[PDB]
Amino acid sequence: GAMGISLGNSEADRQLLEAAKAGDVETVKKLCTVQSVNCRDIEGRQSTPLHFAAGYNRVSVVEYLLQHGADVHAKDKGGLVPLHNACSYGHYEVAELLVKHGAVVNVADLWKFTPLHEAAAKGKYEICKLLLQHGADPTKKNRDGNTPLDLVKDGDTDIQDLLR
Amino acid sequence: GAMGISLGNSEADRQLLEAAKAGDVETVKKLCTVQSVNCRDIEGRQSTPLHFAAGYNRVSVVEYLLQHGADVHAKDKGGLVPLHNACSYGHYEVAELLVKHGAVVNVADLWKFTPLHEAAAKGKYEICKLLLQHGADPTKKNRDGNTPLDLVKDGDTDIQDLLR
Numbered sequence: 001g002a003m004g005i006s007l008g009n010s011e012a013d014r015q016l017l018e019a020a021k022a023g024d025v026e027t028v029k030k031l032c033t034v035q036s037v038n039c040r041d042i043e044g045r046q047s048t049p050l051h052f053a054a055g056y057n058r059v060s061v062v063e064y065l066l067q068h069g070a071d072v073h074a075k076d077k078g079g080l081v082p083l084h085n086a087c088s089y090g091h092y093e094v095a096e097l098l099v100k101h102g103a104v105v106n107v108a109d110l111w112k113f114t115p116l117h118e119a120a121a122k123g124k125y126e127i128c129k130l131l132l133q134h135g136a137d138p139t140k141k142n143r144d145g146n147t148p149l150d151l152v153k154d155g156d157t158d159i160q161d162l163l164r
Numbered sequence: 165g166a167m168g169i170s171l172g173n174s175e176a177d178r179q180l181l182e183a184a185k186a187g188d189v190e191t192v193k194k195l196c197t198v199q200s201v202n203c204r205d206i207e208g209r210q211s212t213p214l215h216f217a218a219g220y221n222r223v224s225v226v227e228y229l230l231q232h233g234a235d236v237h238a239k240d241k242g243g244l245v246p247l248h249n250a251c252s253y254g255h256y257e258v259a260e261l262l263v264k265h266g267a268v269v270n271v272a273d274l275w276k277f278t279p280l281h282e283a284a285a286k287g288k289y290e291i292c293k294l295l296l297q298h299g300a301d302p303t304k305k306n307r308d309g310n311t312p313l314d315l316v317k318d319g320d321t322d323i324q325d326l327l328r
Contacts, residue, residue, distance in 0.1 A: 001252070001277030001306075002242035007209075008274050010243070035237045035268055042241055045171075046204065071235070073199050077206055078166035079174070088165065104199060110172050113165035 013039040020049035020065070023058035028065070037069045045077045054082035054098065057091040062098070072103040079109030087119040087127055095119075095127050105136040112142040116163075120148035125159055138163040177203040184213035184229070187222040196228070202235045209241045218258045219249035226261050236267040243273030251282040256290050259283075269300040276306040284312035284327065292326055302327040 009017075016036055019027035028049070040046040050070040053061040062082075066072070075081055083103045086095040095115075099105065108114055116136040119127040128148075132138065138148050149163045173181070180200050183191035192213070204210040214234040217225040226246075230236070239245055247267045250259040259279075263269065272278050280300040283291040292312075296302070302312050313327045 001244065001248060001282060002274040003244065003252075004242065006274055007241040008243075010272075010274075034266070035271065038235065038237070039239070040204075040210070042210075046210065071202065073202070075203065077171040078168070079172075080165060080167065084165060088167075102198075107199065108174075110166040110170055110174075118165055 007042050009039070009042045012036065016049055017041050017047070017052055020058065020061055021052040021056050023053075023056065023061055025061055025064065028061055032065070032068055034069060037065065038071045038074055047076045048074045048082070050074065050082045051076060051080070051085055054091065054094050055085035055089055057089065057094055059093050059097070062094050066097060066101045072098050072101055079111075081107050083107065083115045084109060084113075084118060087115040087124070087131070088122060090119075090122050090124045090127065092124070092126050092130070096130060099130065099134050105131050105134050106140065108140070108142075112140075114140055114142075114148065116140070116148040117142055117146070117151055120159070120163065121151040123153050123156065123159065125162065128159060128162055132162070171206050173203065173206050176200065180213055181205050181211075181216060184222065184225055185216040185220050187217075187220065187225055189224055189228065192225055192228060196232055198233060201229065201233050202238055211240045212238045212246070214238065214246045215240060215244070215249055218246040218255065218262065219253055221253065221255045221258060223257050223261070226258050230261060230265045236262055236265055237271075239273075243275075245271050247271065247279045248273060248277075248282060251279040251288070251291055251295070252286060254283075254286055254288045254291065256288070256294065259291050259294060263294065263298050269295045269298050270304065272304070272306075276304075278304055278306075278312065280304070280312040281306055281310075281315055284323065285315040287317050287320070287323065289323060289326065292323060296326070
């Protein structure tokens, strides 16, 4: 078979990833099966449909995917899980959905950045509070020696106090 | 976070992948978690621990992995699922375990080779038989226009009649 230097996706998997990114729920429902639900974007960075849905704030797609076997623990090539994407782009309802379905809050990417580092940097108070309530550690250092507290907007006392 | 051109595995994931390949059950039991069971070999071809266990005939490791959330539908960069590996290397006990746990036998890689294509080409009677008992299609053509029957050893009537 294809063993060797060759790489790529089928059109079906490509269509599902695109649909998940676009929020095209009808195509997602059509193409999502036990086989395809966690397909990887081989020509990109190996994001899954859940990565895309989480990253583009497609709440009903995220919901549908979680209900049909989507893996909240899938990591892209840089160590990012869908919760990283939700927190980095500031999508609260997405982040709440993933967490309630068992996403690990203290997961670290390739550079040791956790979802709390991302939500702190982006300055999303409610997401930070959600993460902390579900066990996120505001003292974890990334590769630069920065904790999420260190990444908080300069002088922002409300979010500093929340993370303290 | 790490978003961008960066890529790589954690040391712990690297160790779980190597443990699965070596048949090191005790290290597998130590490192296999919900976060790690389906990690992808980023420096390699994005195989999972289950690909590795299946390809190296690590029967007890396949079993443990399957019982702890390993994904039979996970595809590597070239479209290969762990079942492809079992059939390419003629591992019957492993192929049997995979199909008991929901593996799809008509799955196709990047070049549209199915597990039946592999077992037929490799000439594994019992594996062929097992795949057919679970619905494998001997009429499916790969990218070359070859069905699994087309790949069977020249004039090998026992395997031809099986596939018919």
